[PDB]
Amino acid sequence: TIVRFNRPFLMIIVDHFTWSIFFMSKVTNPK
Amino acid sequence: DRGLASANVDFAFSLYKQLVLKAPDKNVIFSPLSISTALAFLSLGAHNTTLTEILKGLKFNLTETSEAEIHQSFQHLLRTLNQSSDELQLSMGNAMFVKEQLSLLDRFTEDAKRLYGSEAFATDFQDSAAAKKLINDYVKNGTRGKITDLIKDLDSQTMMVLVNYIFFKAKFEMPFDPQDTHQSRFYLSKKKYVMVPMMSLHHLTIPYFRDEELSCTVVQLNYTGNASALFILPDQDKMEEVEAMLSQETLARFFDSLEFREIGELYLPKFSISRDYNLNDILLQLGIEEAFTSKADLSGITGARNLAVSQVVHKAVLDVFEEGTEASAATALEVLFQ
Numbered sequence A: 001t002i003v004r005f006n007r008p009f010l011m012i013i014v015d016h017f018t019w020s021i022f023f024m025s026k027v028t029n030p031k
Numbered sequence B: 001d002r003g004l005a006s007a008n009v010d011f012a013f014s015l016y017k018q019l020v021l022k023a024p025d026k027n028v029i030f031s032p033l034s035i036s037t038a039l040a041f042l043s044l045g046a047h048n049t050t051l052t053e054i055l056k057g058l059k060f061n062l063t064e065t066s067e068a069e070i071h072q073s074f075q076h077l078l079r080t081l082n083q084s085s086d087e088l089q090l091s092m093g094n095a096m097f098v099k100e101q102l103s104l105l106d107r108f109t110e111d112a113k114r115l116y117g118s119e120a121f122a123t124d125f126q127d128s129a130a131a132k133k134l135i136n137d138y139v140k141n142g143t144r145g146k147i148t149d150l151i152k153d154l155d156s157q158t159m160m161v162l163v164n165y166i167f168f169k170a171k172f173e174m175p176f177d178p179q180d181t182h183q184s185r186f187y188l189s190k191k192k193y194v195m196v197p198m199m200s201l202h203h204l205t206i207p208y209f210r211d212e213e214l215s216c217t218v219v220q221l222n223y224t225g226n227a228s229a230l231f232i233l234p235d236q237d238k239m240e241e242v243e244a245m246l247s248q249e250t251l252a253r254f255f256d257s258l259e260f261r262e263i264g265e266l267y268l269p270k271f272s273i274s275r276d277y278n279l280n281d282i283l284l285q286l287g288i289e290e291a292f293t294s295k296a297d298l299s300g301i302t303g304a305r306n307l308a309v310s311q312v313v314h315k316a317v318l319d320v321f322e323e324g325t326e327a328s329a330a331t332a333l334e335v336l337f338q
Ligand SMILES: C[C@H]1c2cccc(O)c2C(=O)C2=C(O)[C@]3(O)C(=O)C(C(N)=O)=C(O)[C@@H](N(C)C)[C@@H]3[C@@H](O)[C@@H]21
Pocket: A014, A015, A016, A017, A019, A020, A021, B009, B248, B251, B252, B253, B255, B256, B257, B258
């Protein structure tokens, strides 16, 4: 299986201890 | 507290949808937790409709949790989110910057310190450059240099600014080897592509979920046993479709549906992005309206209905590299006299 983040994607940084979303992002252009 | 947790996740998705609406094709980075915390701090001084509008806008249900329990929940959360290990640094702070002669109620300043960790810094807003430096330096210190000009313009008649910052720096449990980073295509769309530094890992076992109904693939890269990055990769031309399905329910389903899977190759760009926002229009859309008008009741701050919100600003940065991730954000609520 290959997972290739070569197109727009979401990244969500979370903490399980508190069930918190620290940061949410959509990357449409990483350049 | 599962109640705080659910409200904060719901608020995150509501904010995300409206931030995308500003510019649906642009990069997005924000800290929903920073904005929730800053507005909860403001609510400590709010009464009556101003108060209920803030708490309901933050997605709290006042029939299941009182104002006091909400603040107690933020106090607990904040104490947990200041921690340091070799793998993870996290800091969050709150502050108020106040015209020196403005009389503040002792209850408010006591509660702000006890519950939100907020000191009060005397600020001469009529010396706008000095006031902006004081605030921006506080955010620069708290974010270890990563957010430096949160406040650009600041009304010389400002009475108070409430500020939250968050700082996060972590190592991946499975770091990428820089030797395996190479320039590779990134498709901005089916027909537009550029070359970016593309990190890669080989033969790794991580939590994985293919959502065929939503045409997306989900993987989780851990930093520690509690902190992780959930990545959602829509199939080509399905980003808007996936965005349309986002919610607390959908995110929980993604997490519950993850299973460890052997991955032949994972490719992820090395990138650093930054955005800044004025949140007035969004907060009004979310029902937080009286705080911005002459009907505002912030009399828990001063003992009179003599303050209202003028501007809400947010700035956030996200840096992803082979060893880990750094992300920071700050929120300022600027307050005028009335
Ligand atoms: C960190 C949690 C989280 C954070 C922010 C927003 C969220 O919606 C969540 C979750 O929904 C979580 C889950 O549902 C779990 O699946 C979940 O329910 C769960 C649990 N009940 O302890 C888990 O430990 C996780 N599962 C085994 C993969 C996962 C949680 O990690 C996340």
